Each structure stands twice: as structure tokens, then as C-alpha cells.
Design a protein around this ligand. Sequence first.
Ligand SMILES: CC(=O)SCCNC(=O)CCNC(=O)[C@H](O)C(C)(C)COP(=O)(O)OP(=O)(O)OC[C@H]1O[C@@H](n2cnc3c(N)ncnc32)[C@H](O)[C@@H]1OP(=O)(O)O
Ligand SMILES: [Mg+2]
Lengths: 160, 40
Amino acid sequence: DDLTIEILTDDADYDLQRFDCGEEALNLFLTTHLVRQHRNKILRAYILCRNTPERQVLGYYTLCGSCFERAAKNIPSVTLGRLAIDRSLQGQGWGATLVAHAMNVVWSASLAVGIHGLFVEALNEKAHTFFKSLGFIPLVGENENALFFPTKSIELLFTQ
Amino acid sequence: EQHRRVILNEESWTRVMDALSNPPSPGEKLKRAAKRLQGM
Ligand SMILES: CC(=O)SCCNC(=O)CCNC(=O)[C@H](O)C(C)(C)COP(=O)(O)OP(=O)(O)OC[C@H]1O[C@@H](n2cnc3c(N)ncnc32)[C@H](O)[C@@H]1OP(=O)(O)O
Ligand SMILES: [Mg+2]
């Protein structure tokens, strides 16, 4: 394939304006907020692009260190806040590969510093069904739009 | 502050606690995505 997955490279230019994943909020995020937030260390942006000097982006994901706590104990984790796949690549299994690439980053970081799980943001029902098909455990009530995958399950995937 | 502080309700908490003690076995779909990642 022509396509590659990499962390945004700080001193490079990407073709972003043409991107359309079918949800204006994600498109907008990519073309006006993703680069500034990555460079300011707000989040860690990862890109699915064509591997040409022109570097045409066709999908992305974001990562941020986080920690889950309860009410009335803390768990250090990583959150995948945003995931997007351009229309052209939809129905081609690319989105799941991005989650798998995400899982390999989170695993690597657990091996270095000690991270216990991966949390994900599911804003609409179509995404909720996606991460559930990837084995993500759905959370309830106030935590509805969150699903979790343990590091141990991630370890199994690339070790089994 | 976008999903960097997960403040879990008692039920959501137990689901995670249980996912750590009984980690899910990777499904057939996820394994496929990992096979694609191998060839890249
Ligand atoms: C909400 C609306 O009505 S439109 C707004 C769109 N919403 C969003 O974009 C929100 C964020 N998007 C997401 O949550 C996800 O990325 C989704 C829902 C867009 C899914 O993206 P996709 O990349 O199509 O999913 P995936 O990467 O798994 O591959 C597509 C499908 O083809 C299948 N597939 C997997 N590998 C391959 C392959 N090599 N070749 C062909 N098909 C494959 C998968 O089973 C997958 O099933 P799914 O559609 O249930 O996910
Ligand atoms: Mg696809």
C-alpha cells in the first residue's frame, strides 16, 4: 500500500484542506486545531497519510495522558479523544488499524512508565458500536461516552 | 480538559476494575487490524 501511520512531524507540511470523514467537527478540528494543539503539547496527533512528499492526510487520531478516579483510588491511563477516516478509505478496515496503532503506542508507554489502560471517546452511537466491536468495555451513566481496553488485553494482541 | 480526568460512577468503576482482573481476549476483528499493522 501507499499509506503509512506516523506521529505528526513537527517541522513538516501536510495536505489537510481536502479531508472529509463525513462529520464537520472532526474535519474542522484537523484543518484548524490539530497542528497547534500537538505543537503546544496539548495532545499527541497521529496521522494516516499517503507517504509522498506532498503528504496527503486521510485519517488521524489523538492521544493524551489521563487518569480515571471514582466518587465518595486513581488509575493512570491514555485517552484516544478523536479518531477520523476520510470517506475515500471508509469500508477498508483502516479505522481499526489506527486503533491498533494507538494500542501499540499505549502498550509501549506502559512498558516504559506504567500505564494501566486505554480509554476512548464515543460521541455518537455509530462510533460506540465500532469500539465495542473492537472489544472496548462500555461504561455507564455519567461515563456513557467512554469505553475501556486494559493494557493486559493490548499485550495479548501483540504477544499471543 | 478534554477526557484527561475520567471521574467514574460506581458501576463504570467496577467494569474497569473487572476488565483489569479479567482482561478481554482480543476478538477476530482486532487481530485483523493488528495483522495490517504488522505489514506496515
Ligand atoms: C455518524 C454518521 O452518520 S456519519 C459521521 C461519521 N462519524 C465518524 O466519523 C465518527 C468517528 N468514526 C468512527 O467512529 C469510526 O472511524 C467509523 C465509525 C467511521 C468506522 O470507520 P471505518 O474505518 O470504516 O471502520 P474500520 O476501520 O473498522 O473499517 C471499516 C469496516 O470494514 C471492515 N474491514 C476491516 N478490514 C477491512 C479490509 N482490509 N478491507 C475491507 N473491509 C475491512 C471492518 O469490519 C469495519 O467495520 P465497521 O464499519 O463496523 O468499523
Ligand atoms: Mg477504512
